[PDB]
């Protein structure tokens, strides 16, 4: 197989350093990158994977490339510290997917949010009906802690889709002690 | 069949990369490939003389690395335009720049590759503003 492009949106904010999740939150998001990068290894290697973040910057260290062992080397010294701004993370992920190599790739993007973002529901509905006018399905896995039941990104899930394009699957964060594989075991079942 | 009077349009960045390329490798003949656009029969343009990697043992047809053709030309495809090659360049600094035996050795390869396969010959030590080398 299937043609797509998935932009991993890691969290590098200063809440992602502790160990409420399995041993390390860096290990939780890191093993999430392991299962999505091996998941795109199991997917079409014509597809491409590139790293982006939301906190303190919108970091393009690697190109949206079919290689991923380089990103496996980019798992090191991620240093999660900064201030979350995911609202520009949608747009930087999207023009990141508007400088692609081919249009036969679909656009299904994952996202890793683990801090209270100053996102208006007006902002994510401008971005959400923007993605209605841009044909992108985004399945978000919430990390860290922002809400025990994420609501604004639920509104982004609802306002992204309608009647045909429900590629908005939201694994809301279990911010207490939950496993590194139990959170990601549901998107590997169904994205 | 019947054959029309041909014509070679330039973009002059051709000539700038010939003076800079042959100026850079000035004690040695160089070999390269010339990019442009096949407009029609009686005209053809050069819009890009681009760098080609060195040979150390022999300036020949083996100076064209095909992975540099895929990588170089493909990264020209993800530059602003994927235009078509119009031939090939080289140099002769050591003398009055006539067609070496290498040129007739690879001319049939270059016209197996292209329709025209027009040579580009230069001595980089001629002039400062005047000669059309």
């Amino acid at each position: 197989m299937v043609l797509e492009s998935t932009m991993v949106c890691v969290d590098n904010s200063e809440y992602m350093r502790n160990g409420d999740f399995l041993p390390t939150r860096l290990q939780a998001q890191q093993d999430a990158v392991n299962i999505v990068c091996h998941s795109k290894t199991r997917s079409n290697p014509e597809n491409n994977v590139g790293l982006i973040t939301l906190a303190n910057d919108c970091e393009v260290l690697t190109t949206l490339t079919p290689d991923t062992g380089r990103i496996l080397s980019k798992l090191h010294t991620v240093q999660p510290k900064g201030k979350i701004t995911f609202c520009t993370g949608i747009r930087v992920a999207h023009l990141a997917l508007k400088h692609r190599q081919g249009k036969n790739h679909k656009m299904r993007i994952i996202a890793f949010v683990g801090s209270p973002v100053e996102d208006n529901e007006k902002d994510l509905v401008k971005l959400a009906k923007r993605l209605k006018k841009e044909k992108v399905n985004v399945d978000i896995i919430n990390f860290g802690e922002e809400e025990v039941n994420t609501e604004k990104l639920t509104a982004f899930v609802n306002t992204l889709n309608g009647k045909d394009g429900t590629g908005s699957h939201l694994v809301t964060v279990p911010p207490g002690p939950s496993l590194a594989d139990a959170l990601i075991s549901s998107p590997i079942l169904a994205g | 069949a019947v054959d029309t009077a041909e014509q070679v349009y330039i973009s002059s960045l051709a000539l700038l990369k010939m003076l800079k390329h042959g100026r850079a490798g000035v004690p040695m003949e160089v070999m390269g490939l010339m990019l442009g656009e096949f407009v029609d029969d009686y005209t053809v343009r050069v819009i890009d003389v681009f760098a080609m990697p060195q040979s150390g043992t022999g300036v020949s047809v083996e100076a064209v690395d095909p992975v540099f053709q895929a990588k170089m030309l493909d990264m020209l495809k993800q530059t602003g335009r994927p235009e078509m090659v119009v031939g090939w360049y080289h140099s002769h600094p050591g003398f009055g720049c006539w067609l070496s035996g290498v040129d007739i050795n690879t001319q049939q390869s270059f016209e197996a590759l292209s329709e025209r396969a027009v040579a580009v010959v230069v001595d980089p030590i001629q002039s400062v503003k005047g000669k059309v080398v």
């Binding site: 200063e14 809440y15 350093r17 502790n18 160990g19 409420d20 510290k81 802690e145 207490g176 002690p177 | -």
Partner: protein, 373 residues
Amino acid sequence: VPGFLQQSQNSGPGQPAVWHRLEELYTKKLWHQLTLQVLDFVQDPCFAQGDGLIKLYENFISEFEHRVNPLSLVEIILHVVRQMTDPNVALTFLEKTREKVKSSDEAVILCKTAIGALKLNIGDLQVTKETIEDVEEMLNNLPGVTSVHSRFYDLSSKYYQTIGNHASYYKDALRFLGCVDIKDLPVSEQQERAFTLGLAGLLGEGVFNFGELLMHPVLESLRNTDRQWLIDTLYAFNSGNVERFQTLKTAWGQQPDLAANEAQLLRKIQLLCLMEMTFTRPANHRQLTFEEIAKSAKITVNEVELLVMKALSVGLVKGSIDEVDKRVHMTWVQPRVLDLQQIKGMKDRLEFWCTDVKSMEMLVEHQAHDILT
């Protein structure tokens, strides 16, 4: 262990609402709202009685958290040394948190500003040369934290207190004045910081134009609330070398520390003439008299010689000592602060130059217009 907050859960009114929550913070193993809770323990309005209790537990937070930044650990060890009131246990703790902490968020300079912050009791001469200088030696990466630059003012200004380089109160004043941006500490202490900023800037005479940058906000808000003449006699050291009411009003109000610098403040008004005579006056007059230098300088005739030669020792001017008539010739000078009327009259003579050279330029081109072809 939650039993430490079962006994230390009581610190104020309405207090265990954050302690019964705190035993969900670290027992549910989140540590950055507990970084906010170390910020809460810095914040805690009390005698700060539990910090000497919590300090072993915060050492434990550094043990089985092993990721948080020790900025808040310095911010809590100033509270612990405030509670215990002796620096040596936090010198053992200080060298401890200097040898065991190599944290990525500027651990070395928070340790050197911990030596600077806890330097006030260990003496300020044996150690202000080595490690206070080692703060900016270790500031080779990025001088933009402004916490290390404000604390760097603090240790560099204690180095100003233990007297060395009076004239480093100008650049030291560029470290407090170049650290603080918005007021973020009480104005009713800031105007005393501007009070002693003008006093110690008057003691440090290396820049001698101390009314230089005084469109600076977090001093000028204090200039409009302090005594109003002190700024005005710094303007009698900035603009006008007259008004003995002003340059003596700094003897009326400021009694001490004037006669120690009084002949050098005479020197500063005797260069304030040197900006007046060619900055303010029309052109230069090409030849400027002993009555002008001596009268503006309120000095005799036989000191204008030492005045202008001493000005050549300063190097502000390169003037020739025209004293065949005791009437000095001018050269280039270092300027003073451009006032708004200096802007406008500068626009007058400057636009005068602009449209005269441009207009007569077009006239010369009009005479040379017929010879082009």
